[PDB]
Amino acid sequence: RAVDCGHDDLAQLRCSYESFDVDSGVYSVSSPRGAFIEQSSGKECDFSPMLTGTPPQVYNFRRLVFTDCNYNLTKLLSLFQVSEFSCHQVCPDALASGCYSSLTVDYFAYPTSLASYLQQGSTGEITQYNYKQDFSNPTCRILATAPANITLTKPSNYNWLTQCYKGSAFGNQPHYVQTGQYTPCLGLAVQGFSAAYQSHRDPITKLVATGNIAAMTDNLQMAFIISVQYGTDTNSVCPMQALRNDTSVHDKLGQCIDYSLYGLTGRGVFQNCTAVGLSQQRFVYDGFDILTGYHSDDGNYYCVRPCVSVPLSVVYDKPSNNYATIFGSVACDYVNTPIQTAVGCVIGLVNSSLVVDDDKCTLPLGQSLCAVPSSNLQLAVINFTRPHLVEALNSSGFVVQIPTNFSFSI
Amino acid sequence: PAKADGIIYPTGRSYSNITLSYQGLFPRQGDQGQLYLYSVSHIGKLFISNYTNETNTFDNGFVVRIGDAANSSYPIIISPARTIKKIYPAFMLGAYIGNFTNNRTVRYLNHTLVILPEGCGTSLSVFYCVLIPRTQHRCPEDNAYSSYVIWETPHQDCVNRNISLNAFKHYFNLTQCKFFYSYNITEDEHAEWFGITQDARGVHLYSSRKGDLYGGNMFLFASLPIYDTLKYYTVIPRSIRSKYNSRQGWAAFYIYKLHQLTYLLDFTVDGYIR
Amino acid sequence: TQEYIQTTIQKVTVDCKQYVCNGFEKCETLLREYGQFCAKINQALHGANLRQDESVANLFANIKTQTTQANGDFNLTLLQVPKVTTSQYSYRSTIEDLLFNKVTIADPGYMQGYDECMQQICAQFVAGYKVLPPLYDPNMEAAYTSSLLGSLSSFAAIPFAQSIFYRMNGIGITQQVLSENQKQIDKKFNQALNAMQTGFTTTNLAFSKVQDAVNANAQALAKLASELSNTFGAISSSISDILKRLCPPEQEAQIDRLINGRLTSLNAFVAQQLVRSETAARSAQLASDKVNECVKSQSKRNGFCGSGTHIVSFVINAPDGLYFFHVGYVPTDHINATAAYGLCNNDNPPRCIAPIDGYFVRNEWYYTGSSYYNPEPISMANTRYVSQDTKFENLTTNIPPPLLN
Amino acid sequence: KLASELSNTFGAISSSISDILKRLCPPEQEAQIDRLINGRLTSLNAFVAQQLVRSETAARSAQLASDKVNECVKSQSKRNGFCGSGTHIVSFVINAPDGLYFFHVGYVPTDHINATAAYGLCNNDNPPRCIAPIDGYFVRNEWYYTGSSYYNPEPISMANTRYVSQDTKFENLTTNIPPPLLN
Amino acid sequence: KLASELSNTFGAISSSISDILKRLCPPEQEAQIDRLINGRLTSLNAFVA
Ligand SMILES: *[C@@H]1O[C@H](CO)[C@@H](O[C@@H]2O[C@H](CO)[C@@H](O[C@@H]3O[C@H](CO)[C@@H](O)[C@H](O)[C@@H]3O)[C@H](O)[C@H]2NC(C)=O)[C@H](O)[C@H]1NC(C)=O
Ligand SMILES: *[C@@H]1O[C@H](CO)[C@@H](O[C@@H]2O[C@H](CO)[C@@H](O[C@@H]3O[C@H](CO)[C@@H](O)[C@H](O)[C@@H]3O)[C@H](O)[C@H]2NC(C)=O)[C@H](O)[C@H]1NC(C)=O
Ligand SMILES: *[C@@H]1O[C@H](CO)[C@@H](O[C@@H]2O[C@H](CO)[C@@H](O)[C@H](O)[C@H]2NC(C)=O)[C@H](O)[C@H]1NC(C)=O
Ligand SMILES: *[C@@H]1O[C@H](CO)[C@@H](O[C@@H]2O[C@H](CO)[C@@H](O)[C@H](O)[C@H]2NC(C)=O)[C@H](O)[C@H]1NC(C)=O
Ligand SMILES: CCCCC/C=C\C/C=C\CCCCCCCC(=O)O
Ligand SMILES: *[C@@H]1O[C@H](CO)[C@@H](O)[C@H](O)[C@H]1NC(C)=O
Ligand SMILES: *[C@@H]1O[C@H](CO)[C@@H](O)[C@H](O)[C@H]1NC(C)=O
Ligand SMILES: *[C@@H]1O[C@H](CO)[C@@H](O)[C@H](O)[C@H]1NC(C)=O
Ligand SMILES: *[C@@H]1O[C@H](CO)[C@@H](O)[C@H](O)[C@H]1NC(C)=O
Ligand SMILES: *[C@@H]1O[C@H](CO)[C@@H](O)[C@H](O)[C@H]1NC(C)=O
Ligand SMILES: *[C@@H]1O[C@H](CO)[C@@H](O)[C@H](O)[C@H]1NC(C)=O
Ligand SMILES: *[C@@H]1O[C@H](CO)[C@@H](O)[C@H](O)[C@H]1NC(C)=O
Ligand SMILES: *[C@@H]1O[C@H](CO)[C@@H](O)[C@H](O)[C@H]1NC(C)=O
Ligand SMILES: *[C@@H]1O[C@H](CO)[C@@H](O)[C@H](O)[C@H]1NC(C)=O
Ligand SMILES: *[C@@H]1O[C@H](CO)[C@@H](O)[C@H](O)[C@H]1NC(C)=O
Ligand SMILES: *[C@@H]1O[C@H](CO)[C@@H](O)[C@H](O)[C@H]1NC(C)=O
Ligand SMILES: *[C@@H]1O[C@H](CO)[C@@H](O)[C@H](O)[C@H]1NC(C)=O
Ligand SMILES: *[C@@H]1O[C@H](CO)[C@@H](O)[C@H](O)[C@H]1NC(C)=O
Ligand SMILES: *[C@@H]1O[C@H](CO)[C@@H](O)[C@H](O)[C@H]1NC(C)=O
Ligand SMILES: *[C@@H]1O[C@H](CO)[C@@H](O)[C@H](O)[C@H]1NC(C)=O
Which residues pair with A266 in a beta bridge? Predict the structure, then answer.
């Protein structure tokens, strides 16, 4: 013997209770239709500064910040051969198929033989004096090799700061790079280092910078530290592979549809609405950071609501094996014989204007309504019997009711 | 904060008819800030204060209250009457400082972020440049040098496009310049608000002329690509050369340092912070 | 003295799958491993709501009255149903209408709440819970209360003025004082009743209890809605952000944190709803005991009804309970009088006497009521024969007639 | 619930300790066993707190059962509806699986007769003397005493009646005077 | 019980914030600190209830 939970709301109840037989009672049973894609006209991110000139070293890293542009990720991944990547709170497939509000890229010439010194908890010279990765946004660290046919010009060698200190009569005072900032010894080290353990000195600030040399490889090896942000700008940075054609919302209003509103992905219910909030920001939020409205290009304001489920109830009667479905607190227009009741639309009950005394009601349906098995299920109304009325007498004394005959009740 | 003074509006989003707690760069309550006044010249020699000899620290940034008392009549600073207009501050921010050959004022080594109002207050020009001092009579490589200024002669001007710039070029040689941005300003007399802050994504400039012009809420309008940490700023002394019959007043401005504080913001139905 | 006793709590059922996964199809595959916990949560909530419905039916069956009667100088306008009604309910009283207008309750919506929330609490459909309707609509509860307002094995049809006369004669005041001061009694009664509408303010204990009873349900619903914003160590509290920002070997790890966190929070919601549900059932038993003692009869027990000597009390409907109006007898002035333990004659067998519900006060010896000073002649109706005591007053000049021969 | 909280995996690869030991490694065995340890300790804390609420509830309800025995079982209760329905006569108590089970015998009427009653009766003497009944009424069909719970017209007597003060609500008798009102 | 709930490690390397700060690196400190934060906020909810 088996039960297909799907077919009927009573099954669902039997599968939830995990028993072929369930008692009589009023139980509760468990209860992406389009696309609204809105995007800008289009703009290309300028990746030429990294792909054109000579790459800099670890201490003198160059940083590009991109906002409100589209970039060809496939072309960039075709230009470079990735040796090793390690991401934090994000994955590169989500970088391929998503949009972010900003994109910060730090790139420099870096040998793959020193790839362990760029790691998360490393204590080498690179982390102490050259570059410290910042872990406060979703970020990735990519080490890639540039082929010989690329437009980049290989440097003379690989340089990095070995130590950077200052001061006298207190010993050496080590100066250590900050999280995501340049080293204090940058002005001494801009010229670079030519021999191993070559030391440069500045007489004004009494700062000393010492470097180290790695031989230049056959193919230029470069390192990337990218970082992404969410919910910062009105526009967004999106890969060209994630761009889809625009769709309007003049139809499909009032249904749970997926939206891509200038890079904002989610699902919800859109309704035409009176304009609130500031138009320029474009996105109206609530206290909890849920998208409340969207000031659209069409010109209309659309108050966004998360798509919901209509609550369900089952009025099961075990002796007659008859059930009815209550749609909780929703009118019968939406459900579209259903009958509108004080507890919502219900299908499976007939209305016959029958009244049942309190104590005769075995299936109470919310308010003063009942389902009786008189087989078919009928909608009733609970009404208690009014007390016996003893009429007063206009005469000198009063009228009293004294018991004749009795019984014993336990 | 009951008038929402110096409040940077959240970027990329808006709120409507709610109150929520925000942590960000906000000024302290009851902070008087720093008074800076721009006066009128003697047409004689220029009249300035010692706004250049002071060493200010950028920290997290600052907010400038521009245009207060832009309709009141006060005695002139140089003749202690006349109506008072609104003047725009000129800034000079850099990461590294040094000294001139005469050890006077502040020099900014390497790349310097210079913000100058342009076109007699009709536009704002922002550039990162390395400025190399000039060797002349009163220019900063001489013993006769006192301070560097920028001057606008309202007589005789306005419309010269490079008046603030030619005033800056009088003192420095602009070489190695990464960028030059220009933003147009409509001529008004409303009290405004301006902010500068540096993040990991560059230098952000905020203003109340973008949105909430009649109030005080500041909105982002420029994200400058400066990634070296700014450590010092100086207010360039600005002087106006006009006749004795033409002397007119100029509103002072206040600079309040920003701090990492928690604020409770009240939003209206229109979305503003009041 | 107004007293509120809480009868119900808000019946809330939770759709566990909708609450945990929010309709994201990748979450249901992970939740199928945690299959039985959602069913156990639903079964526990269903049992709690069923027990609360049984308690409501038992209370409203206990407070019904077998016979009723169809008002002197007493003004019972407030207690009775308004002749022209400002209330959508035809059985509600005026004072019940005032009490329900001064307490603010969010309208859950039982007939068309979904359409009202879709046009232009409404968080039930979003979060995944649902407020079940109460067992009786407020019209039927007001009908029960109004039938009780009309009101042993025998029923006497004496009017309200006669009932007040007998109830205030039973506490110590003699018949002569009630006959002489009838107009003042009616004026004092009507005036006290007229302060009931002005008593529905703050810094009142019963109204504060009503407000806290209203606020407890809202606090429970707010906790249930706000536990969905907890990240539980994940990168976001939204399933969509996890699914669109991460990759499948790491998505199931982070979606799970949300699954395990939300089920534990739901379990703690079920546990605190069980404590509140059994707490509200013992109150209903108390509320009926109070109806059967203070309302259906005159209570001789001190302090159970309101302050002072109890005379009569009325009960109306309140948000999630019943609201009482205990009319008591309090004195404002008093006189110090010399009383006697008893009086004995000078016969050869000494016969001694003692008062009933009164004192033998002086200014020779007179009888007065225990709750009002009115010196009356000592009679056989006022006094009971008692054995002699040495602290009794041996009176020989003027002897009351019950001690004569 | 206590037995079924052991089936929760708590984010681990399995809810069984042996499966974790036989499928994982001494670096990551303790990372998953500690998830079972922390999850089960929190589950035990929720069970203990639930039992403390249930124990203090049954301890107060056992005091209610002792008061119900002392009022309904050991004596006849004069309260209205405290024990059962109708007028209380006698009660019995037996043992239940987790408490005490009571059987409250009550006097309930079935039929009734409307009768004309009197507040009291007074004679025609120059000092008026008045009487009032106890545990009953003065009914007709001239005036007879009857019980307060059963209709049975009986002759008025001293036993049936108590004296009272003169009231204007009382009936004044001239024709037939009961023996307690005789001079 | 309220004082003894602060001695629970909740799966971290230590129950002290100071030990987590001086023994781990910023990729992994917020992973263990959030474990202590979520554990103590849940134990505070049980104390209030
Ligand atoms: C800020 O500006 C100062 C001044 O221009 C910069 O210092 C200069 O840095 C360059 C390159 O780092 C130095 O040039 C080098 O000179 C040596 C010979 O001394 C030569 O062998 C090298 O090939 C290279 O050309 C220059 O001497 C040095 N000048 C001074 C006065 O320090 C500084 O680097 C700038 N800071 C930043 C962060 O760019
Ligand atoms: C100095 O005086 C001038 C006089 O014009 C002030 O300009 C005026 O400022 C008020 C500020 O409330 C402006 O009123 C606004 O009008 C807009 C419609 O344009 C309305 O939507 C706003 O709600 C508000 O009522 C007024 O328009 C403006 N005058 C002009 C000609 O633009 C200036 O604000 C004064 N400055 C100071 C510092 O007191
Ligand atoms: C992203 O870059 C790739 C390669 O640089 C582009 O692919 C080329 O598209 C043109 C036109 O369709 C073809 O003729 C080439 O053969 C393609 N090359 C490769 C290697 O696929 C692609 O079109 C770019 N995407 C966008 C949106 O411009
Ligand atoms: C800053 O302070 C210095 C003093 O150290 C001022 O330098 C003086 O300038 C005047 C005017 O040219 C000369 O007569 C003095 O000889 C200078 N003194 C020294 C010690 O150099 C400088 O003018 C001040 N800058 C201001 C006020 O902007
Ligand atoms: C390799 C020499 C090992 C010497 C071992 C003796 C003592 C070392 C004590 C602690 C080791 C910390 C350094 C671990 C490697 C850092 C990797 C890097 O630098 O990026
Ligand atoms: C530290 O102590 C050493 C030796 O006692 C001394 O040479 C040095 O100057 C001291 N440094 C500081 C900063 O106190
Ligand atoms: C997308 O829209 C463009 C119009 O710019 C159209 O040419 C193209 O065919 C569309 N593609 C799809 C898949 O709808
Ligand atoms: C949306 O509503 C606005 C005002 O409420 C109205 O001006 C506009 O025409 C409406 N648009 C549609 C498509 O109904
Ligand atoms: C049932 O039918 C009667 C008669 O038409 C009607 O008055 C009543 O409202 C109906 N009840 C419901 C719940 O529709
Ligand atoms: C219930 O019955 C009473 C009389 O017995 C009547 O006045 C009232 O209208 C009835 N109510 C319903 C809902 O049937
Ligand atoms: C009481 O009623 C029962 C049935 O209702 C009947 O059998 C019995 O005779 C009656 N007794 C009297 C005294 O009327
Ligand atoms: C704004 O909020 C207040 C209270 O928070 C409310 O009374 C008012 O109706 C709201 N206004 C609008 C337009 O929603
Ligand atoms: C500027 O001059 C004033 C003169 O009162 C003086 O108080 C102030 O310290 C000076 N500022 C600097 C930086 O020297
Ligand atoms: C510039 O010279 C003055 C002269 O005393 C000195 O106080 C100041 O510290 C110097 N500043 C720099 C940046 O060297
Ligand atoms: C500036 O200060 C430095 C600091 O020692 C000094 O060597 C130099 O001589 C000073 N120059 C002048 C012009 O005062
Ligand atoms: C500044 O630029 C002018 C332009 O011709 C040049 O003559 C002068 O020598 C420059 N000054 C310095 C200090 O380089
Ligand atoms: C700024 O104003 C000038 C002068 O009216 C005009 O030539 C220029 O195009 C404007 N720029 C922008 C961006 O509006
Ligand atoms: C009884 O009190 C109500 C309260 O407003 C009043 O309207 C009514 O007139 C009063 N009754 C009499 C008879 O005065
Ligand atoms: C009354 O007489 C009794 C009998 O001797 C005596 O004990 C008592 O003290 C007397 N009381 C007074 C007040 O005289
Ligand atoms: C006598 O009895 C009648 C009976 O109705 C009553 O009305 C009246 O008040 C009594 N007293 C007098 C003094 O008539």
Answer: A259
Q: Under an 8 A CB cutoff, do E46 and C233 touch? A: no
CA nearest ligand 2 atom 28, residue: B190
Residue C238 to residue C252: CA distance in whole angstroms:
14
- Among residues E26, B203, C249, the alpha carbon closest in space to that of A139 is found at E26
Tell me how far apart the alpha carbons of residues A49 and A63 are, in angstroms, rounded to a whole number. Answer: 10
Residue for token pair 């808000």: C10
Please name the residues in contact with D126: beta carbons below 8 A apart, sequence gap of 6 or more: none
**How far apart, in Å, are the Cα atoms of D133 and each of A229, C166, C170, D160, D164?**
92, 14, 15, 6, 10
Name the nearest CA neighbour of A277 among B14, B209, B22. B14
What's the rounded Cα separation, in Å, for the pair B239 and B151?
5
- Please indicate whether, in this complex, the C-beta atoms of E49 and C268 are within 8 angstroms of each other: yes
Give the ligand at the shortest distance from the Cα of A167: 6
For residue C346, give the ligand nearest its CA: 19
- DSSP labels, A291-335: EEEEE-SSS-EEEEE------EEEEEETTTTEEEEEEET--HHHH
Tell me the C-alpha distance between A263 and A229, whole Å: 12
Residue D59 dihedral angles phi and psi, to the nearest 5°: -70, -35
The pairing of strands C12-14 and C129-131 is: antiparallel
Helix then strand count (H, E) for chain B reads: 1, 19
Q: What CA–CA distances, in Å, run from E6 to C268, C381, E3, E15, E41?
A: 21, 76, 6, 7, 11
* Apex D63 CA angle, D58 and D68, nearest 5: 120
Amino acid at position A77, single letter: L
Helix (H) or strand (E) holding A70: strand A70-71
Query: Which residues of chain A make contact with B225, given a CB cutoff of 8 A?
Result: 65
Q: Closest residue of D to C301, CA-based?
A: D79
Taking the C-alpha atoms of C121, C127, C132 and C137 in order, what is their torsion angle to the nearest 10 degrees? 10
- Going by alpha carbons, the residue nearest to atom 10 of ligand 15 is B103
Distance CA B127, CA B181 (A): 6
* Ligand 12: centre distance to CA B1 (Å): 22
Residue D156 exposure: Cα atoms within 13 Å on the Cβ side: 25
Instruction: Report yes or no: D35 at the E interface, CB cutoff 8 Å.
Output: yes
Q: Is A286 exposed, middle or buried (0-12, 13-18, 19+ CB in 10 A)?
A: middle
**Resolution of this structure in Å:** 3.0
Instruction: Check CB contact under 8 Å for E45 and C233.
Output: no
C399 CB-side CA count, 13 A: 17
Q: What is the DSSP string of C219-288?
A: HHHHHHHHGGG--TTSS-S-HHHHHHHS-HHHHHHHHHHHHHHHHHHHHHHHHHHHHHHHHHHHHHHHHH
**Contact (CB, 8 A) for C151 and C65:** yes
E35 touches chain C (CB under 8 A): yes
Judging by DSSP bridges, how do beta strands C393-394 and C358-362 pair with one another? unpaired
Which of A30, A333, A400 comes nearest C154 by C-beta? A400
DSSP-assigned letter for residue E2: T
Q: How many CB pairs under 8 A join A and B?
A: 71
Pocket test for ligand 13, best of B48, B50, B106, B146 (most atoms within 8 A of CB): B50
Q: Are A379 and A337 in contact (CB under 8 A)?
A: no
CB B17 less than 6 A from any atom of ligand 2? no
Residue pair B207/B194 in contact (Cβ under 8 Å)? The answer is: yes
The separation between CA C215 and the C-alpha centre of its own chain, rounded to angstroms, equals 17
The size of the A-D interface in CB pairs under 8 A is 79
Q: Looking at residue C376, what DSSP letter applies?
A: B
Please check whether residue B266 is in contact with residue B19, taking contact to mean a CB–CB distance below 8 angstroms.
yes
Of C259, C216, C222, C219, nearest in space to C237 by CA: C259
Q: For residue B210, how far is its CA from the centre of ligand 12 (angstroms)?
A: 26
